[PDB]
Amino acid sequence: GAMGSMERASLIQKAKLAEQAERYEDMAAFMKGAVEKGEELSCEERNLLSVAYKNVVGGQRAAWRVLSSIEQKSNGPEVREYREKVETELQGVCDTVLGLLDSHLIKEAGDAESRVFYLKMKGDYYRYLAEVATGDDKKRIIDSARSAYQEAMDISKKEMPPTNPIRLGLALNFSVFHYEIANSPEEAISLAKTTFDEAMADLHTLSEDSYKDSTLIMQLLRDNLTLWT
Amino acid sequence: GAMGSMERASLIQKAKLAEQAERYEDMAAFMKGAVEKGEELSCEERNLLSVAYKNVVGGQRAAWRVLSSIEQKSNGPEVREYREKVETELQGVCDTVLGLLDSHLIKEAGDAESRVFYLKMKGDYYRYLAEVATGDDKKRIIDSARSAYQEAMDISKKEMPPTNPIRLGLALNFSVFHYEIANSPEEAISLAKTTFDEAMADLHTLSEDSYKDSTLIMQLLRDNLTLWT
Amino acid sequence: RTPSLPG
Amino acid sequence: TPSLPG
Ligand SMILES: *N1CCC[C@@H]1[C@H](c1ccccc1)c1ccccc1OC
Ligand SMILES: *N1CCC[C@@H]1[C@H](c1ccccc1)c1ccccc1OC
Ligand SMILES: [Cl-]
Ligand SMILES: [Cl-]
Ligand code: NA
Ligand code: NA
Ligand code: NA
Ligand code: NA
Ligand code: NA
Ligand code: NA
Ligand code: NA
């Protein structure tokens, strides 16, 4: 591949430059090349990988929603064709991320922080595929997302305190999955509420800076709860 | 090219969809395909072409400036290498636009307004190349930009009134070229001043909306004159 | 849709 | 120096 001849450290450095320049496609390509060196990512590097692909797929999802809305209201072939083009590119990015996770990053060995991070990510990218899927294909994709989130949840509850920001963000996204994808708003609401309440009870153990990190995500859980109820 | 098999009308339709979806690279590719059909563009279509490529090149210019600033402050090879990567991509987009103008938008333009519009665009895209060029290549690019702008000036003075917004915007950009690129502040000031005065003489003949259009661009000339004088 | 984690 | 914004 085009990054094969570049040093790992140079790929990381250029990913950071690409972020500063808001060149997220480049950022993702540099981070993919770094993953392909075969070494485990540090916490900082995991964040870089995630930010890069989040921004790439985020732009595609926003465009897909615009085009899908135009298409639904129109219902020549042009709107459908262009929506399909964007959809295929979005699916390609999701398949790229899922492939990196399965081929390189998800491991049975590993610290809880990385295992939960990557299983959550797998759930997220199956969720993005589910947003554009239909019929029975959608069913299988939904189950793949659920399974990844559930394994991440099980690890996070055993191996991380209830205020851990990664655990909290996983619960936030899994609850969004229940509400938006799986037609399970009651489960979404219950998960957000118990997660919020169990974090609030343990805030007293945290430093000022950890308190801010945890409460910022708790505030997102509350925002969704108050939206939904 | 890749758009050769798509109907012209479908390309225009998809360019407009891409704009709604903020997919400006797609928008530019669709408009390139439409140009390459070989028919003249309407006013609406040449504005779509200009908007699409301005968004693409504007993002590249902004990224190049971020990276150039980091590079300047740093004074490993990575910052320079990544700046060069973005630079090469920017040069490619400018070469693409210039190729459309030379083959064959300028020569096929059926009226003075559109010929001035395209010649101004040619000056602009050579100017963008000049911002990142060095040495003898930069000198050639600067002469090419000047020649395109000057031909546009000659036509606009013969064929369009001094308050015409396309004539005013040409003079604005050519004066910016003189000051920022060609190190000719005296020519920049002279051009902006003459343009400003010749437009003011005719402001009283304009409708309310045209007066607004013309004074808006006059104020852009004024802003530059204040910076320059 | 409901907002997910912004990062 | 700024150019035409469109
Ligand atoms: N979201 C998931 C992983 C990257 C990104 C994360 C974040 C999480 C919650 C709110 C904002 C940002 C992130 C991004 C960059 C640096 C650190 C970081 O989380 C630790
Ligand atoms: N700039 C030149 C060609 C497209 C764009 C132009 C414009 C010029 C000055 C201020 C705002 C916009 C433009 C863009 C979109 C529709 C019309 C239009 O001018 C006719
Ligand atoms: Cl298409
Ligand atoms: Cl590079
Ligand atoms: Na390698
Ligand atoms: Na632990
Ligand atoms: Na409940
Ligand atoms: Na809310
Ligand atoms: Na409420
Ligand atoms: Na006159
Ligand atoms: Na005058």
Number of Cβ within 10 Å of residue B119's Cβ equals: 25
Cα(B83)–Cα(B229) distance, rounded to whole angstroms? 33
Number of Cβ within 10 Å of residue B155's Cβ equals: 18
Cα(A160)–Cα(B156) distance, rounded to whole angstroms? 71
Q: Which two tokens stand for residue A40?
A: 């485990």
What is residue A97's three-state secondary structure? helix
Number of Cβ within 10 Å of residue B121's Cβ equals: 25
Number of Cβ within 10 Å of residue B188's Cβ equals: 24
Number of Cβ within 10 Å of residue A161's Cβ equals: 14
Cβ–Cβ gap A20/B79 under 8 Å? no
User: Quick check: A163 and A114 in contact, CB under 8 A?
Assistant: no
- Nearest Cα to B50, choosing from B66, B65, B31, B37? B31
User: Quick check: A86 and A70 in contact, CB under 8 A?
Assistant: no
- Nearest Cα to A118, choosing from A141, A94, A102, A142? A102
Longest Cα–Cα distance of chain C, Å, equals 16
Q: How many whole angstroms from its chain centre is CA B220?
A: 16
D2 contacts in chain B (CB < 8 Å): 176, 220, 223-224
Contacts of A112 (CB under 8 A, 6+ apart): A155, A156, A158, A159, A160
Resolution for the entry shown, Å: 1.2
User: Quick check: B83 and A37 in contact, CB under 8 A?
Assistant: no
Helical residues (DSSP H) of A101-207, grouped into ranges: 112-132, 135-159, 165-180, 185-200
Q: How many whole angstroms from its chain centre is CA B111?
A: 19
Helical residues (DSSP H) of A75-134, grouped into ranges: 78-100, 112-132
DSSP state of A42: P
User: Quick check: B98 and B133 in contact, CB under 8 A?
Assistant: no
Residue keyed to tokens 């135009």: A70
At A72, the amino acid letter reads: Q
Question: Which residues sit with Cβ closer than 5 angstroms to ligand 7, an ion?
Answer: A 189-190
User: Quick check: A36 and A104 in contact, CB under 8 A?
Assistant: yes
What is residue A184's three-state secondary structure? coil
Q: How far is the CA of A37 from the centre of ligand 5 (A)?
A: 5
User: Quick check: A155 and A115 in contact, CB under 8 A?
Assistant: yes
Q: How far is the CA of A224 from the centre of ligand 9 (A)?
A: 9
B72-107 per-residue burial string, b: 16 or more CB within 10 A, e: under 16: eeeeeebbbbbbebbbebbeebbebbbebbeeebbe
Q: How many whole angstroms from its chain centre is CA B100?
A: 13
At A25, the amino acid letter reads: E
Cβ–Cβ gap D3/B173 under 8 Å? yes
Q: Which of B50, B54, B176 sits opposite D1 (nearest CB)?
A: B176
Q: Which protein residue's CA is at the shortest distance from atom 13 of ligand 2? A: D6
- Nearest Cα to B222, choosing from D1, A9, A96, A220? D1
At B204, the amino acid letter reads: H
Domain regions of chain A by residue span: 1-229
Contacts of A172 (CB under 8 A, 6+ apart): A192, A195, A217, A220, A221, A224, C4, C5
With a 6 A CB cut-off, is C6 part of the ligand 1 pocket?
A: yes
Cα(B142)–Cα(A150) distance, rounded to whole angstroms? 61
CA–CA distances in Å: residue A82 to residues A62, A67, B37 = 14, 8, 20
User: Quick check: A217 and A169 in contact, CB under 8 A?
Assistant: yes
Cβ–Cβ gap D1/B124 under 8 Å? no
Identify the CATH number of the domain defined by range A1-229.
Answer: 1.20.190.20
Rg (CA), chain A: 19
Cα(B168)–Cα(B35) distance, rounded to whole angstroms? 26
C7 contacts in chain A (CB < 8 Å): 47, 50-51, 54
Cα(A185)–Cα(B24) distance, rounded to whole angstroms? 37
Rg (CA), chain D: 5
D4 contacts in chain B (CB < 8 Å): 169, 172-173, 217, 220
Cα(A25)–Cα(A58) distance, rounded to whole angstroms? 11
Residue keyed to tokens 């339709």: B13
Q: Which two tokens stand for residue B63?
A: 């990224």
Cβ–Cβ gap A179/C2 under 8 Å? yes
Number of Cβ within 10 Å of residue B157's Cβ equals: 12
Q: Which two tokens stand for residue A113?
A: 């922080």
The 3-state DSSP composition of chain B as helix, strand, coil percent (nearest 5) reads 85, 0, 15
Q: What is the DSSP string of B35-58?
A: HTT-PPPPHHHHHHHHHHHHHHHH
- Strands (DSSP E) found in B47-194: none
Instruction: Provide long-range contacts, Cβ within 8 A and 24+ apart, for A158-162.
Output: A158/A112, A159/A112, A159/A116, A160/A112, A160/A113, A160/A116, A161/A202, A161/A205, A162/A195, A162/A198, A162/A199, A162/A201, A162/A202
CA–CA distances in Å: residue B210 to residues B155, B168, B214 = 21, 12, 6
